[PDB]
């Protein structure tokens, strides 16, 4: 009632009515450089690194394969005990790689080892529902969400969950850290985006602008904004510095829901993957779809952009991941 | 390519060789999705299969490997992970014949068999399981026979008027579950009665999955 009663009177103008004077971004033409083949099952999640070369991808065949994007040469083949993996993350330095399977165990694998095989660093079996997303704050602490409408901050050295974020009503489906890995926003199925903190312990502000199940989420490189991808064919980029909604990107041309949200280095091109076998590129400032990323046989599931904005990776269910530039 | 990328592409070919081999042993084996209708589903078929989170059982029978995946009772909604099991060989949907006159420990908003008919229909309307076949298994054979002698059998279905015999009741409830799915030309429903013999239940499973892998091979060549 009185929560957002005064938040409407302070909004006389919108973000779209201001960015109509700056240089509009034309049609963005992105050509598929190389398609990351070798997979035999549908891809669900991926993650990039700081070097913009290595990347990890999760596949349903029980193999967490890691390779470099510049040469498309498979480096390591990690046999997964739980073939039904739905999420995976990559370390900022490239030491440990975790993946969330259906066995509710975040099996963390150590790459840089004295042996040749990729051994298991730790196992996080504290969750009760399906592991939906995981993100690496550093090589010791990790924030992993699950299908138990809660998030948890696990520690590799400790082995147990430090803080269990229990503030969501719907099923958690996404996670997105900050450029300094201090705060992070999570979007659940209750159309709620909560900004969970580490120093305070848990969320400090929520956003309920959406109308359906939120699938994926990202984070703006600035640190004050973030976009959310729901299932009702619309994305609402909320504001962390004004606990409101800046603008929305909805269109009746598309009918499927959003499955992946990503941001570039400058944050201009809003990479948003959909279930229409293609991916869209939003202006994120004026709500204009510049270009569309087509070429995938099945619907895309994962979408990540390098930290320097060099390459853009799109993964679909056809066991083929494409690299864009 | 100076003594490093030449070995890098060679290691990738060795990995691709293992990945190609990994897909062969994964395609010849049988995958089974065991999704029950109550709190504890598939209480009988998992006793003979030689072994938080899902439970998967790996066992070889008649020179054929089987993988039965059971999710149990989870608080997460099925809509967010029902597309992960797309491409499974067979689906086992165990339903008990003692759900028409029994109510689960809940708010009693709907009957057990009414919720079982809606749960079985919810799987068929999903756009991912329009091709996979669901194998129905009727539990509590003799227990349902004793219930017939002291029940009108028309609790869930009042419009039904038939014989009060296990031979006719099992045949009527089989057609009632076969009329719930709207895709009858794409999906083939297998109905069987779970027996305590400990070898006849998996024999029908082996014969059912053989009828499915023979259709996938015919679909592979294009004769389907």
């Amino acid at each position: 009632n009185q929560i957002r009663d005064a938040r409407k009177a302070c909004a006389d103008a919108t973000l779209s009515q201001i960015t109509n004077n700056i240089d509009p971004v034309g049609r963005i033409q992105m050509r598929t450089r190389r398609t990351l083949r070798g997979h035999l099952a549908k891809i669900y999640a991926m993650h990039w690194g700081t070097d913009s070369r290595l990347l990890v991808s999760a596949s349903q065949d029980g193999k967490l394969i890691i390779w470099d994007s510049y040469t498309t040469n498979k480096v390591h083949a990690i046999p997964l005990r739980s073939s039904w993996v739905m999420t995976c993350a990559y370390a900022p330095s490239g030491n440990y790689v975790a993946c969330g399977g259906l066995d509710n165990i975040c099996s963390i694998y150590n790459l840089k080892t004295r042996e040749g095989n990729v051994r298991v660093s730790r196992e996080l079996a504290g969750h009760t529902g399906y592991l939906s997303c995981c993100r690496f704050l550093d090589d010791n602490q990790i924030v992993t969400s699950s299908g138990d409408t809660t998030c948890a901050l696990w520690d590799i050295e400790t082995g147990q969950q430090t803080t269990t974020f229990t503030g969501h009503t719907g099923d958690v489906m996404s996670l997105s850290l900050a450029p300094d890995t201090r705060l992070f926003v999570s979007g659940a199925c209750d159309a709620s985006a909560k900004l969970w903190d580490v120093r305070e312990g848990m969320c400090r502000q929520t956003f309920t602008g959406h109308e359906s199940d939120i699938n994926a989420i990202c984070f703006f490189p600035n640190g004050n904004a973030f976009a959310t991808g729901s299932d009702d064919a619309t994305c609402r980029l909320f504001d962390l510095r004004a606990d409101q909604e800046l603008m929305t990107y909805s269109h009746d041309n598309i009918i499927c829901g959003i499955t992946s949200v990503s941001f570039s280095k400058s944050g201009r091109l809003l990479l948003a993957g959909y279930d229409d076998f293609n991916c869209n590129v939003w202006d994120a400032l004026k709500a204009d779809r510049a270009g569309v990323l087509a070429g995938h046989d099945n619907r895309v599931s994962c979408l990540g952009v390098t930290d320097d904005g060099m390459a853009v990776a799109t993964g679909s269910w056809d066991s083929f991941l494409k690299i864009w530039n | 390519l100076s003594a490093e990328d030449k070995a890098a592409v060679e290691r990738s070919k060795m990995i691709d060789r293992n990945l190609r081999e990994d897909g062969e042993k994964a395609a010849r084996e049988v995958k089974l999705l065991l999704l029950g209708a109550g709190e504890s589903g598939k209480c009988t078929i998992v006793k003979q299969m030689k072994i938080t989170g899902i439970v998967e059982t790996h066992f070889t029978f008649k020179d054929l490997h089987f993988k039965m995946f059971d999710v149990g009772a989870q608080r997460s909604e099925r809509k967010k992970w029902i597309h992960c099991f797309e491409g499974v060989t067979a689906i086992i949907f165990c339903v008990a014949l003692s759900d028409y006159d029994l109510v689960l420990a809940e708010d009693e908003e709907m009957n057990r068999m009414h919720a079982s008919m809606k749960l079985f229909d919810s799987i068929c309307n999903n756009k991912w399981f329009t091709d996979t076949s669901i194998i129905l298994f009727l539990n509590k054979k003799d227990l349902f026979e004793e219930k017939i002698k002291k029940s009108p059998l028309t609790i869930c279905y009042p419009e039904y008027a038939g014989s009060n015999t296990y031979e006719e009741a099992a045949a009527y409830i089989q057609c009632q579950f076969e009329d719930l799915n709207k895709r009858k030309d794409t999906k083939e429903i297998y109905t069987h009665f779970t027996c305590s013999t400990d070898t006849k239940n998996v024999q029908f499973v082996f014969d059912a999955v053989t009828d499915v892998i023979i259709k996938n091979n015919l679909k592979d060549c294009g004769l389907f």
Partner: single-chain antibody
């Protein structure tokens, strides 16, 4: 238990062979690819043979091509070395490097203990110095020269530095001329522009002395440096 053991006879007569057998332990086999490097007395290192993972790529040196037959038994985790005829030139201490090649790897990581043997085009890695007598404690610079510029088109220069403690096997100090090895302190710093290849040991503790080597990884056969001993 990552150490490697080698087997070899005391001395062999011309006209036969010893069938040098090397075994592995600890690390996951069938994924690295063993090397063959012999060290003649009062001489420098020299590559002999190398087999890849799975007997795919088999390379021989210009000095042993046609006489030595490198073999292995991966199900046994054992490496063999068949020879046709032994000569007085082959009298050296054969080593196994146990290297692996991928992006972000540490090639030439852990050399084996090595066995002894006694019998009764190519990048010429030259060094400006051979023995630098300097007091330990702080920064000491060591350079290395190459015949061809090791800077490749991708942007990675393949150079590896070895220490070879007196009485032991050489160990990796800095790979790619700029990245520190796994298991070495933060004292080793490597710089250079294609051919300079300067190595600054800013700490130079007591155990840092030994015969150093700089080897290229662009042309086969692989040639090692002349040797730089520190006191």
């Amino acid at each position: 238990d990552v150490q490697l053991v080698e087997s070899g006879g005391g001395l062999v007569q011309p006209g036969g062979s010893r069938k040098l057998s090397c075994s592995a332990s600890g690390f996951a086999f069938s994924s690295f690819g063993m090397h063959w490097v012999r060290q003649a007395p009062e001489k420098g290192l020299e590559w002999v043979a190398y087999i890849s993972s799975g007997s795919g790529t088999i390379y021989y040196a210009d000095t042993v091509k046609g006489r030595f037959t490198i073999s292995r038994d991966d199900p046994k985790n054992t490496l063999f070395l068949q020879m046709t005829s032994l000569r007085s030139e082959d009298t050296a201490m054969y080593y196994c490097v146990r290297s692996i090649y991928y992006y972000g790897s540490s090639p030439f990581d852990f050399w084996g203990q090595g066995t002894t043997l006694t019998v009764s085009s190519d990048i010429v890695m030259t060094q400006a110095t051979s023995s630098v007598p300097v007091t330990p404690g702080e920064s000491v610079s060591i350079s290395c020269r190459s015949s061809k510029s090791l800077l490749h088109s991708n942007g990675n220069t393949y150079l590896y530095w070895f220490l070879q403690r007196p009485g032991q096997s050489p160990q990796l100090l800095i790979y790619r001329m700029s990245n520190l090895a796994s298991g070495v302190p933060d004292r080793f710093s490597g710089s250079g522009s294609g051919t300079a290849f300067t190595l600054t040991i800013s700490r130079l503790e007591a155990e840092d002395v030994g015969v150093y080597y700089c080897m290229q990884h662009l042309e086969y056969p692989l040639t090692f440096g002349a040797g730089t001993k520190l006191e």
